[PDB]
C-alpha cells in the first residue's frame, strides 16, 4: 500500500535499480488492476492517486536519465525495457482516463494530467536532434480515450449546454485554451482520426464533448486575444494558419453530418455566427445547412424556434456574400407569431429585425403589416416583449410616416365647423366601417393593414405597470423624438424588471385601504 | 389604364414611343402601350432589379441596348431586337443600386 509505495519510490529514486526497478515497474500494473477492480467498488482510496503520482515521478526520472533515446553497442535490452515500462505506464494512464464510472475526480482527472505531463516532457527525450514536439501517437491515443470515456448522462445535457464530463471540462479550461499548438495538433489528429472507419463510426456519436471543447471564443485562429506557449520547440504548428482553419472547417462539417439532437442543434445555431463562421475558409458550405434550418418546417412542437436562430448566421452569410433567399419578407412575416414573444430569444431577433426593416426599398403596406401583426401579437404578451415592441413601432412609424394613418385617421374627426351633411356622412361611414386586416394572409403587401387601424396600442395604454403604460402614452404624445436606442430598450426581463422595481429611483411611503374587507376578503374567502 | 407588374416596381423607362419596360422584383417586363399588353419578361437575376436605362443608334453591333442593375452585383445588357436576350454582363463588388451609360 502506502508503505510499499513510498519504499519503492525511495528505491526507484535512490541511485539505480535493476531487479528492484523490475519489481517497482511491474507494481504499476498491479496498481492499475487494483484501481480497475475498485472502480465503482471503493471510490475513496487516494492510494490509487498516490500510486499514479509516484509512478509518474518514477517514470519521469527514468525518462530523464535512462530513456529510449538512442543506442551505441549492446544496450539492446535496456532501451526496450525502459520504453516498455514507459509505454505500459502510458497505456495504464489511457485506460485510467477511459475507464471511470462517474466524476470520481482521481482516476481520470489525474491520469489526464499524467499523460499530458508525460507527453509534455516527451516532446524532447527521443532521437529528435531538432525542433520537434512530436507527441502525435500519444496524443491520438489520449483523444481516443477522451472520447471513449463515456460517463452516465452528463454527455448531451438534455436541458442546454454541451457536455458535463468533468475531465473534458477541465481539459477545455486549462489543457485546450491557454496555448496555440496543442489545440492545432488536436484538430489535426481529430481530422486524421475521423477518417478510419471504426473510429469515425464512434466519433460522430458523442459530439457534445466537442461542442464543450469549441464554444469558447478563445481559438488560435480568432484574433481577439492570443496566447503563449509551454512546449519547448513547436514544430511549425502556429505557422500553417490555413491548415488549422481547413481542419476546423472539415471536422465541423463532418461531425455536423452525424446524429443531430435538437439541443445541440440549437446550440450550434446560436453559436453559428459569432463563434465559428469567421473560422471557415469557405463559409458558403454552411449555407445549405442554415437555409434548411431557416425553412425548417417540422412536426416537432419546439421546432419553431430554429428559424429564429438560423436568421443571424444566414443574414451574415448573405451580407458577406450576397446570396438570396427568395420571398424573404414573406418568410419574415410568417416567422412572427405568438410563440416569438413568449420565446427565450427575443432581443437576438429584434436586433436583427432592426436591420431588416430599416431597408429603404420596401413598402408602406409591408411596414403596416409588420406592425399591425406585431400589435395583435403584443396584446397577449409579457412586458419583456411590450417594452421592445412599442419603441419598434415608434421607429418604424417614424421612418415610414405614411403608417401614421393607423394611429390617426383624420376622416373620423368631428370638428365644430362642420356641415350638418358632413356630420351626417360621418355618422353613416363610422357605422358602415369594418376593418380589413386579416391575420391569415401570408403576404405582407396583400394584408390590408394600412387600410385597417391600430387599436392594440391604445388598449395597451392602460397597463398594470406604470413604466409600461407611460411608455405606451407616447402614441398619444407627439413625435418629437427621433429614435429610441432599441438595444437599450431590448432585454428587460421579469427578474431585472422587479430588480429595478425594488431598486427604483425614489421611495414613497405605502398607503392603506379604507375598504374594510372583513368577512369576504376576495371573492374566494 | 394601368399595367400590372406583380412585384413592386423600381423603375419604368420608355424604349419605343410604343413599348415601355418596367423593372421591379426579380424580373423586368415590357409592355406594348398601344395595346395595353405585356409581351416580354426576363427574370435572369437573383435579387430585385433596381434600375434600367436604354441606348439607341450609338456606334455598336447592337442597334439598341437595355441595361439592368439588380442588387446582387450584376448589371446586364439585353438586346431589344432579338426578344430582349442578354448579351453581356458585369459583376461588381456589392449590390448595385443604380446604373447608366453614355
Amino acid at each position: 500500500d502506502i508503505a510499499k509505495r513510498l519504499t519503492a519510490a525511495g528505491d526507484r529514486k535512490q541511485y539505480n535499480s535493476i531487479i528492484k526497478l523490475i519489481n517497482e515497474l511491474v507494481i504499476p500494473e498491479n496498481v492499475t488492476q487494483l484501481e480497475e477492480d475498485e472502480t465503482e467498488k471503493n471510490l475513496r482510496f487516494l492510494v490509487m492517486s498516490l500510486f499514479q503520482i509516484f509512478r509518474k515521478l518514477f517514470s519521469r526520472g527514468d525518462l530523464t536519465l535512462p530513456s529510449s533515446k538512442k543506442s551505441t553497442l549492446e544496450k539492446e535490452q535496456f532501451v526496450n525495457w525502459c520504453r516498455k515500462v514507459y509505454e505500459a505506464f502510458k497505456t495504464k494512464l489511457l485506460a485510467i482516463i477511459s475507464d471511470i464510472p462517474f466524476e470520481t475526480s482521481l482516476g481520470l482527472d489525474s491520469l489526464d494530467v499524467y499523460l499530458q505531463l508525460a507527453e509534455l516532457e516527451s516532446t524532447h527525450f527521443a532521437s529528435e536532434k531538432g525542433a520537434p514536439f512530436f507527441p502525435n501517437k500519444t496524443f491520438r491515443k489520449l483523444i481516443i480515450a477522451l472520447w471513449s470515456s463515456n460517463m452516465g448522462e452528463i454527455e448531451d445535457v438534455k436541458s442546454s449546454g454541451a457536455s458535463e464530463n468533468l475531465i473534458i471540462v477541465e481539459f477545455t479550461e486549462k489543457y485546450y485554451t491557454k496555448f496555440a499548438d496543442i489545440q492545432y495538433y488536436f484538430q489535426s489528429e481529430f481530422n486524421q482520426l475521423l477518417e478510419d472507419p471504426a473510429y469515425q463510426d464512434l466519433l460522430l456519436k458523442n459530439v457534445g464533448k466537442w461542442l464543450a471543447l469549441v464554444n469558447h471564443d478563445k481559438h488560435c485562429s480568432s484574433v481577439d486575444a492570443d496566447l503563449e506557449i509551454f512546449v519547448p520547440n513547436p514544430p511549425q504548428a502556429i505557422e500553417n494558419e490555413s491548415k488549422f482553419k481547413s481542419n476546423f472547417e472539415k471536422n465541423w462539417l463532418s461531425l455536423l453530418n452525424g446524429q443531430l439532437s435538437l439541443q445541440q442543434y440549437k446550440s450550434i445555431l446560436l453559436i453559428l455566427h459569432k463563434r465559428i463562421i469567421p473560422h471557415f475558409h469557405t463559409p458558403t458550405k454552411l449555407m445549405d445547412f442554415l437555409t434548411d434550418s431557416y425553412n425548417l418546417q417540422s412536426s416537432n412542437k419546439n421546432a419553431g424556434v430554429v428559424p429564429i436562430l438560423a436568421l443571424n448566421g444566414l443574414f451574415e452569410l448573405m451580407k458577406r456574400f450576397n446570396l438570396e433567399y427568395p420571398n424573404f419578407y414573406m418568410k419574415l412575416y410568417q416567422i412572427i407569431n405568438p410563440d416569438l414573444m413568449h420565446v427565450k430569444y427575443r432581443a437576438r431577433f429584434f436586433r436583427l429585425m432592426d436591420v431588416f426593416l430599416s431597408s429603404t426599398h420596401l413598402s408602406a403596406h409591408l411596414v403596416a403589416s409588420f406592425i399591425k401583426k406585431l400589435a395583435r401579437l403584443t396584446l397577449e404578451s409579457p412586458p419583456s416583449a411590450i417594452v421592445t415592441v412599442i419603441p419598434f413601432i415608434y421607429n418604424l412609424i417614424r421612418k415610414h410616416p405614411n403608417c401614421m394613418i393607423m394611429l390617426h385617421n383624420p376622416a373620423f374627426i368631428s370638428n365644430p365647423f362642420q356641415t350638418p351633411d358632413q356630420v351626417a356622412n360621418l355618422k353613416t361611414l363610422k357605422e358602415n366601417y369594418v376593418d380589413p386586416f386579416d391575420v391569415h394572409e401570408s403576404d405582407p403587401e396583400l394584408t390590408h393593414a394600412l387600410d385597417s387601424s391600430l387599436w392594440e396600442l391604445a388598449s395597451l395604454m392602460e397597463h398594470y405597470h406604470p413604466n409600461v403604460a407611460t411608455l405606451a402614452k407616447i402614441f398619444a404624445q407627439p413625435f418629437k423624438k427621433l429614435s429610441y436606442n432599441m438595444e437599450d430598450f431590448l432585454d428587460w426581463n421579469y427578474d431585472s424588471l422587479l430588480n429595478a422595481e425594488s431598486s427604483r429611483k425614489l421611495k414613497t411611503l405605502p398607503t392603506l385601504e379604507f375598504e374594510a374587507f372583513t368577512n369576504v376578503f376576495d371573492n374566494e374567502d | 389604364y394601368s399595367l400590372n407588374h406583380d412585384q413592386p416596381v423600381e423603375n419604368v423607362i420608355a424604349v419605343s414611343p410604343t413599348q415601355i419596360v418596367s423593372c421591379g422584383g426579380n424580373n423586368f417586363k415590357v409592355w406594348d402601350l398601344t395595346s395595353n399588353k405585356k409581351l416580354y419578361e426576363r427574370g435572369n437575376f437573383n435579387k430585385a432589379v433596381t434600375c434600367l436605362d436604354y441606348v439607341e443608334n450609338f456606334d455598336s453591333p447592337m442597334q439598341s441596348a437595355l441595361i439592368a442593375s439588380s442588387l446582387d452585383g450584376h448589371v446586364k445588357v439585353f438586346d431589344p431586337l432579338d426578344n430582349f436576350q442578354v448579351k453581356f454582363g458585369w459583376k461588381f463588388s456589392g449590390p448595385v443600386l443604380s446604373c447608366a451609360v453614355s
Binding site: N257, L260, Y265, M287, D288, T291, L323, E324 | N44, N46
Partner: peptide, 17 residues
C-alpha cells in the same frame, strides 16, 4: 434531420438561375 452532408446546392441553383 439533415443526415446527408453540408452540400453546396443553393449556391449552385442561384448560380444557374
Amino acid at each position: 434531420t439533415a443526415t446527408t452532408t453540408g452540400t453546396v446546392t443553393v449556391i449552385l441553383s442561384q448560380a444557374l438561375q
